[PDB]
Amino acid sequence: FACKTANGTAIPIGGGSANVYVNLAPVVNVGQNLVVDLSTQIFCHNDYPETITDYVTLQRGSAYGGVLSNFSGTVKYSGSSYPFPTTSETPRVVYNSRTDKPWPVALYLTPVSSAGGVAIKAGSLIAVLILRQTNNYNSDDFQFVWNIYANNDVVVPT
Ligand SMILES: OC[C@H]1O[C@H](OCC#Cc2cccnc2)[C@@H](O)[C@@H](O)[C@@H]1O
Ligand code: NI
Known part of the structure; x- marks a missing residue:
């Protein structure tokens, strides 16, 4: 089990960390949403689907900088919605193919x-999303840590 980003960089077997830059709507009013869809950016695959099933959760979502101070939000993980910053680890998503499948966050x-x-300032850290991977085969329990950076300023009109 490993992950990579579109652009991109990679986190190898055994887990690790990577930095991700996201494009954000430059202007968002009160009552509107910024949608940051990582499912077009982060992709994972199972290295041995014939013998192993990989289980992937969103272990934790944390907010930083301008998002932490100036936004409230939710996280959608594989069809289900949760408070963001998160209050618990999600249910698991199964990875059972060698073909890159999106991480649905x-x-x-x-x-x-x-x-x-x-x-939100350009280049600033806005969120950390922790992917936790386990399997039905051994004791492997790995964290894939995605540091999420704003590509551009976001202005909330006054
Ligand atoms: O993606 C499946 C597995 O790939 C990697 O495992 C390597 C292996 C193996 C293997 C398969 C069959 C028999 N013996 C070992 C790890 O990322 C592991 O956590 C993961 O569950
Ligand atoms: Ni691989």
């Missing part, structure tokens, strides 16, 4: 009433 962020001006 998307953030829905909405400005708090105190956001105004540049709410």
Whole structure:
């Protein structure tokens, strides 16, 4: 089991860390959503699907910088929605193919009433999403840590 990003970089077998840059709507009003869909960016595969089933959860989603201070939000993981920052590890998604399949995570962020001006700065860290991988074969228990960076400023109009 390993993951890579579109562009991109890779996290090899045994887990590790990678940095991900996301394009964000430059302008978002109170009551609107920023949608950050990582499912077009992060892809994973099972290295031995005939003998092994891989289980993948979103172990934790954490907010940083302008997202932490100026947004509230939810995370959608494989069809189910959760508070973001998360309060528990999700149910598992099965990886059972050698073909790269998306990691089905998307953030829905909405400005708090105190956001105004540049709410998210370009190049800044906005979120960490931890992928936890296990299997039905051995004791492997690995973390794939995705540091999510804003590609551009996001302005909340005043
Ligand atoms: O993707 C399947 C497995 O690939 C890697 O495992 C390598 C192996 C193997 C193997 C398969 C069949 C028999 N003996 C060993 C690890 O990422 C492991 O965690 C993962 O579950
Ligand atoms: Ni592989």
